[PDB]
Amino acid sequence: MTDIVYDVEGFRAFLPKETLRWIRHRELERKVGVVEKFSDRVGPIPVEIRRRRSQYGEFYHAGKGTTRIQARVSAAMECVERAAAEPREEIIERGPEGDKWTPAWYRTEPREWVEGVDLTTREPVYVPANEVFHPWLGDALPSHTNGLSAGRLREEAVIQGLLEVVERDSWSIVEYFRIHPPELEVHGELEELRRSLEREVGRVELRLLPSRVEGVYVVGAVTEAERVEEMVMGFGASPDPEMAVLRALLEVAQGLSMARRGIESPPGKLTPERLKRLNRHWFEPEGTVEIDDLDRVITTGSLEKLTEELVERVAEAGLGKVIEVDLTLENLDVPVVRVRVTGASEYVIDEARVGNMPEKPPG
């Protein structure tokens, strides 16, 4: 029974100030190849940028938070998870004995595997290296970082990774069927943050996405701006709808920081009004939802219980198996995991990663 002592940007067993002190003492950023740091503030939101070097090249990573401390923790741990996700021959198996997850798109049996755990059955299951590591170049589809998370504890990382998978499943459903999600109406501090971020662009719009996992809410934020590169999207998923809203808004601020520095992530220049027209489903909401009307199904006591309850709800969702792969580096004693949900949609990452899709949009 590990208490959640912090639940602003995510569910944490330590205060961000403690974690930052710990990151600094352990020299994690240096050890993970951080060579440059930048501090931004987008309206009221601190954003942190890291330039990182590895054998794979030079990369920009970002962190953010409601406080400068959390943004600096977020940026550091982002760098750590990416270093952990780099291919590691140590944990690759080639002639594995046991259960295997073989995704639909494999025309031939994959050769490299990593041992994971089925979080429903607690049985071992082998996962292809291309579904664990990044970058991995051998296979039919590109590798990616959906479900990759670091934490102070493995439970922190599991919760974060699983919520991310649900988040992208919801977003993938909206894009695949071109669903027009309802506008989400907020009050108090969240409304003030939205207004404050809106002062940076033209408009900041909130949406409640259809979630396929009960007890988990997914929120999208979309911007309208006079500059097209400043029309970004942010997403959040949490059992706490307030956290989901916060996460989406923080992602927008992060997006704006990146665009203003000309940093990108995956032909001629679009106009703001045409971008709107191509994305009518986002800009023409179907209905309205009040945040206070949303039930708190999963209330947050201990980290262990929260993990268990989240896993249960995803296992019930008709989205296949919930698999965890340990990516903790031996030298850096930092818990990192890759969470894969075998039939969750990753359409927004790759058109071929459809997952379990119904014939009709979920009404």
Residues annotated within a binding site: 12, 64, 70, 74, 81, 148, 150, 156, 160, 164
H or E segment to which residue 168 belongs: helix 154-177
Shortest Cβ 16–ligand ADP spacing (Å): 5
Concatenate the DSSP letters of all residues of 261-272 into one string.
Answer: TT-----PPPPH
Which string of x and - marks every residue 153-192 that binds ligand ADP (by CB under 6 A)?
---xx--x--------------------------------
Answer with the entry of ligand ADP, Mg ion, none that 151 interacts with (C-beta below 5 to 8 A by kind). Answer: ligand ADP
Q: In terms of CB distance, is 303 or 317 closer to ligand ADP?
A: 303
300 contacts Mg ion (rule: CB under 5 A): no
Residue-wise burial string across 134-160, b where 16 or more C-beta atoms lie within 10 A, e elsewhere: bebeebebebbbbbbbbbbbbbbbbbb
Residue 107 has, within 13 A of its CA and on its CB side, a CA count of 3
- Cα–Cα–Cα angle for 313, 317, 322, nearest 5°? 70
- Cβ contact 72:63 at 8 Å: yes
Q: Backbone dihedral region of 180: left (phi > 0), alpha (psi from -120 to 50 degrees) or beta?
A: beta
Q: Nearest residue to ligand ADP, using CB?
A: 77
78 contacts ligand ADP (rule: CB under 6 A): yes
Q: In terms of CB distance, is 147 or 285 closer to ligand ADP?
A: 147
74 contacts ligand ADP (rule: CB under 6 A): yes
215 contacts ligand ADP (rule: CB under 6 A): no
Query: Both tokens of residue 293?
Result: 């009307």
- Cβ contact 45:51 at 8 Å: no
77 contacts ligand ADP (rule: CB under 6 A): yes
Return the amino acid letter for 156: E
- Cα–Cα–Cα angle for 308, 314, 315, nearest 5°? 85
- Residue ranges for the known binding site for ADP are 12, 64, 70, 74, 81, 150, 156, 160
8-state DSSP, 43: T
Query: Both tokens of residue 343?
Result: 């039939």
Q: Which of residues 125-154 bind Mg ion (CB under 5 A)?
A: 148-149
Interface region with ligand ADP, contact rule CB under 6 A, candidates 33-41, 69-77, 205-213, 272-280: 69-77
Answer with the entry of Mg ion, ligand ADP, none that 143 interacts with (C-beta below 5 to 8 A by kind). Answer: none
Gap between the Cα atoms of 29 and 216, Å rounded:
32
Q: Site for ligand ADP (CB under 6 A): which residue of 52, 152, 313, 340?
A: 152
Gap between the Cα atoms of 26 and 298, Å rounded:
34
Shortest Cβ 234–ligand ADP spacing (Å): 10
- Cβ contact 205:183 at 8 Å: yes
* DSSP strands (E only) in the chain: 34-42, 45-54, 57-64, 99-100, 113-118, 124-128, 148-150, 183-185, 203-209, 217-224, 233-238, 288-290, 322-326, 336-341
Residue count at the site for Mg ion (CB under 5 A)? Answer: 2
324 contacts ligand ADP (rule: CB under 6 A): no
Q: In terms of CB distance, is 14 or 56 closer to ligand ADP?
A: 14
Shortest Cβ 145–Mg ion spacing (Å): 6
- Residue ranges for the known binding site for Mg(2+) are 81, 148, 164
Q: Site for ligand ADP (CB under 6 A): which residue of 66, 143, 146, 149?
A: 149
162 contacts Mg ion (rule: CB under 5 A): no
Q: In terms of CB distance, is 76 or 148 closer to Mg ion?
A: 148
For Mg ion, the binding residues (CB under 5 A) are 148-149
Question: Where do contacts with ligand ADP occur on this chain (CB under 6 A)?
Answer: 9-10, 12, 16, 19, 63-64, 73-74, 77-78, 81, 149-152, 156-157, 160
